[PDB]
């Protein structure tokens, strides 16, 4: 059979107990870390931690030949692929599920803390989340710009706005939230849409599954040129706060006390 | 002086994180809350035992009234856990405690652990595409929410899925059914009539994530109001239009009818 578990956050102790247990068993295990980057572990001490060698795989090796690389495998022995975070939150491995099942080989999955739900430790009432977006880097001149059509339409509803950001993992590339920042401000110059100014509250999200966190909340002018820290970083618009959801970013995220004062 | 928030996952005792066992195995003093959901697949026994130190479970009265009085004076003095379904601070009140622990002057860290919300990316479903999500409770007395219902219809309306937190009565171990929240939603159709919930609309039910094997199905209400799903929890979801790599994981994974490649994509 084949295993698609999730190693979470940040380091190798962020696999769930059942992960490791399942991961050690396996006769072969594949892994990629294209998707997300975990920074506070290495391919080292993944592979200590499970016993087990790592082959990694790029993202043409899944998109191109899973079906020729993993899956021969998995028709005779326990496999394993390992991902960043959960293996089914902000990728396309669910695909992978598919093709499984068409080639007779059965799978499982095997969840792992996902930043999606980790930003419930902004404070931001997880309910209240709307649509997701990611903010993608320009490519020459192929400038990706829908994401703020996603917070346009959530802010109306006054749902707050996940913003995922890019990734290159080839490069070693890894978007910040100042330059996603940047991107939203020059789109709000293109469409002019009222979306995202320098008046405009937002949340940083830097290395989420770490003891200390970068949880910080503020107007885009302030933090804009702020110190994140390192990757990874996710960036959140709000929509409309509740009083509770304002207190613990004035308390815990130091966004500045104006907020508190909710206009009704 | 140190207070750890550790999620205990899923559904059962392995659902924990590496990270959060470890570090409950080396605190002090471990606490645990079971009514903002509830460890279907295991017992504060096994919990317990797979720590190998006492826990103590607070009730919602203890936490929401007394946290400051019962947790946080012993984290002032020593390593304490305190242990929560899921991940914590996905439960909305949790947060608020982070605050009572700076007003004591104790530091606070969260250990987190796969959370519902996220897990529904085993149904197929891209997790961009749910919106708001909602809860729906059991109506009592005078007392008969309906707000979920609108939720599932500005998602719809846009495109977007939606996830239905089902009531659960910790304290009784009283899980509501995907069964009794369609019947709940359908009563709500009859009296709103806005077209967002009936026989012809297609849902999707996510039975105890977590485990290797959960009860993964999507279908039409007609179909499946009467289905068993198996133990508990369970989730409801309405999703919103598909994309059809969605519509093709339902049907090959979770045993849609074809006909929704043609209807709901
Ligand atoms: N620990 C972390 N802290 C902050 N952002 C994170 C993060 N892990 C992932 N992200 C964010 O999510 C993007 C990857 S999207 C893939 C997410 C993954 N399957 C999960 O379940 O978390 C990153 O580029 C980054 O913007």
């Known amino acids: 059979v084949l295993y698609f578990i999730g190693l979470g956050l940040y380091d190798e102790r962020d696999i769930t107990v059942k992960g490791l247990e399942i991961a050690k068993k396996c006769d072969y295990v594949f892994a990629e870390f294209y998707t997300s980057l975990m920074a506070g572990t290495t391919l080292g001490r993944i592979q200590r931690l499970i016993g087990k060698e790592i082959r990694v795989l790029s993202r043409e090796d899944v998109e191109l030949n899973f079906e020729n690389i993993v899956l021969p495998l998995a028709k005779e022995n326990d ?27 059965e799978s499982y999955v095997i969840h792992a803390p996902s930043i999606y ?4 430790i902004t404070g931001l009432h997880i309910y209240k989340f709307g649509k997701s977006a ?10 990706p710009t829908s994401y703020y059509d996603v917070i346009k339409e959530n802010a109306e509803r006054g749902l707050h706005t996940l913003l995922f950001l890019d990734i290159k993992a080839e490069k070693r590339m890894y978007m910040t939230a100042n330059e996603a920042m940047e991107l939203l401000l020059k789109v709000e110059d293109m469409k002019k849409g009222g979306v995202f100014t320098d008046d405009t509250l937002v949340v940083v999200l830097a ?3 770490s003891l200390n966190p970068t949880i910080r909340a503020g ?14 970083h996710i960036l959140i618009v709000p929509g409309k706060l509740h009083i509770v959801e304002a207190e613990y970013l004035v308390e815990i995220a130091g966004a500045p006390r104006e907020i508190l004062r909710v206009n009704v």
């Open 79 to 105: 496999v394993a692929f390992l991902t960043p975070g959960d293996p089914l939150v902000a990728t396309t491995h669910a695909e992978l599920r598919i093709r499984a099942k068409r080639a007779g080989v």
């Open 117 to 120: 739900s980790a930003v419930g």
């Open 134 to 143: 990611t903010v993608a880097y320009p490519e020459g001149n192929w400038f």
């Open 207 to 209: 290395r989420a599954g």
């Open 219 to 232: 107007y885009v002018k302030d933090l804009i040129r702020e110190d994140f820290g390192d990757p990874p």
